[model samples]
Target chain A: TDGIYAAFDTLMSTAGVDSQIAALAASEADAGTLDAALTQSLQEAQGRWGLGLHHLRHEARLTDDGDIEILTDGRPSARVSEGFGALAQAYAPMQALDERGLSQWAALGEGYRAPGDLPLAQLKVLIEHRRDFETDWSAGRGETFQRVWRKGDTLFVEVARPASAEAALSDAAWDVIASIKDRAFQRELMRRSEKDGMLGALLGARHAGAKANLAQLPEAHFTVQAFVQTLSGAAARNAEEYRAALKTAAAALEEYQGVTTRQLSEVLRHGLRES
Target chain B: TDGIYAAFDTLMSTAGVDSQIAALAASEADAGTLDAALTQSLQEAQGRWGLGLHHLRHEARLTDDGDIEILTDGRPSARVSEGFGALAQAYAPMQALDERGLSQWAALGEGYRAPGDLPLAQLKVLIEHRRDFETDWSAGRGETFQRVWRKGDTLFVEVARPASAEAALSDAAWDVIASIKDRAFQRELMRRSEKDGMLGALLGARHAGAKANLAQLPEAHFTVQAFVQTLSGAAARNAEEYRAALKTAAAALEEYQGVTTRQLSEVLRHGLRES
Candidate 1:
């Protein structure tokens, strides 16, 4: 725990502007400086021991409507706010050990890894147990291992099988439980269900401050079309044409861009229609 | 000249943004409404009226020290201001006719065609003798062609030849002289000859407002060095090593950058030196 918190303190400061400048200058001036799990610069400062920048980029919070959300790149940040800090605490030790990147983690045994969950909620699941599971890089899916904490006894990666949505992950106490069980898994799957996920990602963008480039209006129009089908209570996510158009938009936007006027116009169409 | 002024009135409004948006909506909605010398968009607004956006981009002004300086995309402006209003009148017709862009203006039978000399000094030169050069654009430099009052014709591109730094252009009356005699030319060459040209260009930025990206600090440093050399009465512009170091900085800064600390330290080293 002491090592975990020491690593946590270092990891939290990595997102700071001063740290970036310090890293930028270090990159320009020094050679042979990094040979750690992190990039040379990050690995230097306090050993910046963690999963690194990508893991720390966004945060998640469960909304009143029983849906989880993401706030990226700013306020309510991982260390800076309550929502993710609660989970970030859980993440520090796992990430420090997983110093090996996620491909390694994905291979850490047979497993279910949510590809885009930066809140690292799944790892947060491991942090909260009454009994602790200790394993090295060789651990596999659905298996338990010896304890780092139970003084040499076996530890179970216990599941908090909340019986109802009333016992869902957002219920605060649920986060304190050791691992995600049936209810939490159901919630994650429903949130990621194609149509729901696409709409949630699109409409929630303004609040999370996502930017889209203005030049790709044709593709924006197509993405807009996908989310629009939600109004008709349709599964626009799996519709053949719907998926094709959205796939094209996503691929083009792989680089950064600001939302264009036509894109904004599409946003307003939905905004006005519902309001 | 009346047609010229009327056209001037039309051309000036084209640069005026309010006029543009109105014209934009107009072009989009109404067919064949625009058949004046300009097309419909800037694609028609005036061609957008005369030499449109290009002519509007920059103005040449005599700095406080009497050298002509470029105030691009900013203030001390041209023809619309009284300085060039008289000449913008002459130019309105020519620019409307000669739409091939400025290089063609340079090639407009030049020894030196001051294409958009909006300080109106050239017109003042003409108004002194008076057809007021009554039209603009076919105007070029050197190789004196004649006719003063055409006193039924023996023109004098009468030299506004003055004696010293004591008497220079921007002396106000020198403007009224259509020709920049050898003396005026001598003064201009001297002013541009020093750090005057570079420093003035560097600082005024936008004349109204523009900026050279700060990442070009190395080039700026080299420029500073050249001027410093001048302070010592050295061959500032010609020293061989003078350019190499400066060029190195610029090359290093070729890509995107932020103000690195070392760049600021370099700025101070030169700034503190004698000059």
Candidate 2:
């Protein structure tokens, strides 16, 4: 769990810092290398998180007994769960604080609340230094750490450490999180209800029908539509298929939300029957 | 006119002999100077012919005198029609000859009654010599020479000496005479009719309206349409505009045809009134 938290913190911090550094270095003579490195680091971090998230979502589908259908052997669900748990715990402190409190805490001066009231600048430095310390400590915990836990079936994941090293949260990262959360929630329910007998069979059948319906849709038509939409805001000569893909991916989240909710409800009904 | 023809014939024969010499000298180890001289001579001949053709066209237009109103400066018609008449008469013998007779007249060698009868070795020499002669004679009398008469209203311009030493026609110039005939029969009518006047005005108006309409189109709407079209096809992007432009061009052409017929009838009626 600690390892997962540290990985999340490190990944986020790396992304943030790289983005900031790259932005700063963009005008410099040797900026090409910096830009390449920054891009590479961000891509790598995103890729790692993407895989980790996929694994975690798969893990969430397992039964309490850890028994799951061996659709594909040697899956990394256990490792993913442990890693994600650590990541959630590390960010637990931020979750505990209200928005105002967090802001205030972030602004606190070093040694201001101590024996001698420190200057505001000194306090800010102290806070920043402490945040840096926390980030480094979290990174040292490795790329995966347990950060959150639930008493029963409710698991609320958080970052294992402050995302001090990373640039700010980007739209892409936000999208990934949103997508993973819904997927993880849905998968967790499905896995648990799979062993719930007759109700499970009914739920599974409905899901199968939905999947078939989705498959029947003409993908190329959607692709072309997406491409055209993306080009609308782009430079005349530079608008292309890749831009369309990004736009399509962004717009897809809303539809995914509906699908996730329906799946969750079906899983809950299946679980109720078994219970 | 005879003096001009003699100069032109000398120039053509010189260019042909020089070209053959250059081709032969290419295999020599140090023929750079020869090659350069050959190229320079060829370029000079080409330039002379080009300028000659332009002048001839202008002269022909001034001499046509078919429609006085369309004539530049509305110069009074002249009885001088000797140049074109002399050119046609000089080329008549060549025009009247069969292929075998022409080959024999060219003195292409024994058994060379036609081009096909010539051996490869003789064919090269014959082709080069013929090309030079044809180019010089065509420049003197061809459509390039006749375009002037076809393009404007005058048809009785004065007999003038050659514009330059190179602007001369020879007796064997059949292409020039043919060009004169074609211009008189086909292209002259277009120049005399006032249909072009109406087309120019209508097209100009249409262009102005299109410009105004384009300016009124909202930037956002235009951008969206452009972007969508970029990703899709023009039909998908700006269907209305594309279809409208095609229809408008076609309709304009039809209108121009109608106006042309009317203008021709008016010209004919005016001619009868004068007669």
Candidate 3:
């Protein structure tokens, strides 16, 4: 538990901006000031961590139907606010870890990892009874080994069953978690999930605070497409639009691109600045 | 001519770092410091202009074959040093322009544009005789109107003949020029080309200075491929490699993603950070 918290704490500062945003949410600041503060904090954090959070703008609003809407250039773009923080918090830790550290955690191990033949809800139950499982391991193993590990003595154990996603995490958030292979870390995440939920557990307490802030954020509804778009790097998000822009420009180029009238018409199409 | 210079000057500061780099190249700075200075300069320039020169790293060397070679992570990557400054300088002007300005120049007009029926080399000849053409336009009649203007009275005139590329320039650079529809600007570029070559003329004189520094630059060969790569933007450059990396990771993900040994092997494959 101590080691788990220690590892979690190591990544907490990377999401310092997320926590700052959480604090901002609880403040009396005007909407513009709140946005300015977040943008500044995000820039500072990016400078500190060598990350590009360029896609993560501060425009968020709630629609009348109790849904969160993120607007980019006055158009709804992106998903849950928590998803952005969650993924960013997760990505930052991976970045901070040197090659070896990356090797240690990102690598999957042979094991009875969490979610092995267990729904996330049931896994929460197993975590709640963690002390009992520890007792089993103490006695050279029991049902705990069968469900949580292939063998209690070794650092690696083959999973007895495939992992399952029974929670409401966005696809990308789930992909990050599903990609993690450290059995002990998986178990720790399961334990933490009991209190924080999967996203909060994966990202640690700071992101949990961000999640709380976003939960109460008015007129916003989380969209999986938006969240996926957020995780997708800058170019990837707009590749399709860019392709269309190019196609339109090409068509105009064929039909007398030198015409002033035609050129003005294509400006909006060709002038799509990289998002 | 004053308007042209003013517009050029307007975009010049956007490439402020390019001038700083020119000074650095002329300095007695150590190799590491030179590289560091250039990287810092580029970062500052990007901040000032909202541009991503991220692909434009500072690694440049002259090859034994008398060509400039640009290396990314020690692998030769891009083309002519002037092409970058020239393109950046050119690109800055475009970015600084508002919707009307983009509409004004990017649009091709009906007229006797530069290189209408002649090659770029001969277009320079027409520009030198520009005074003669002005005389013809003043009289509302002459061969000058035949080559330099479809009809001298109107703001837009259809090109009398197709454009030609006679001087050395990377394909993208040529594309930018070919895309421009402003006849007067094209005529000015032709006139400037006499002193600075097609590229220097298109980008204006500051890029010519950067070109001089690169000319004497010592293990470098300008690669058309690299220059194209630079202008292509970030993810596009490595999209193929990323695809392969993902493919290999996927193969491993298939053959027991939970295996520790397999997981370690896929780290380098899956661990490519966004370049």
Relative to the unseen true structure, what is the C-alpha lDDT of residue B237 in candidate 2, on a scale of 0 to 100? 27
lDDT scores in order: 0.26, 0.25, 0.30
Give lDDT: candidate 3, residue B112. Answer: 37
Ranking of models by lDDT: 3, 1, 2
What share of the reference contacts survives in each candidate? 0.00, 0.00, 0.00
Sliding window of 10 residues with minimal summed lDDT for model 1 chain A: A222-231
**Could you tell me which 10 consecutive residues in candidate 3 chain B have the lowest summed lDDT?**
B219-228
Cα displacement (angstroms), candidate 2, residue B12, comes to: 26
Model 1's CAPRI class is incorrect
Q: Please give the DockQ score of every candidate, comma-separated.
A: 0.01, 0.00, 0.01
Q: In model 3, where do residues sit more than 4 Å from their true spots?
A: A1-275, B1-79, B82-86, B90-96, B100-103, B106-275
Higher TM-score: candidate 1 or 3? 3
Please state the error at residue B235 of candidate 2 in Å: 58
> Tens digit of lDDT per residue, candidate 3, span B1-275?
21221222222222222324334445755556655654454333332232322223335443344333444445554433334444344434333332211112222233233433445355444433322221111111111112122122222111111011111122323334334444444445444544554344444433343443222101011111100001122322232432333333234322221232222223212211111
Mind giving the per-residue lDDT tens digits that candidate 1 earns over A105-185? Answer: 321233233332223244344334333222222222122111111111222121110111111111111111112233332
Q: What is the Cα-based TM-score of model 2?
A: 0.15
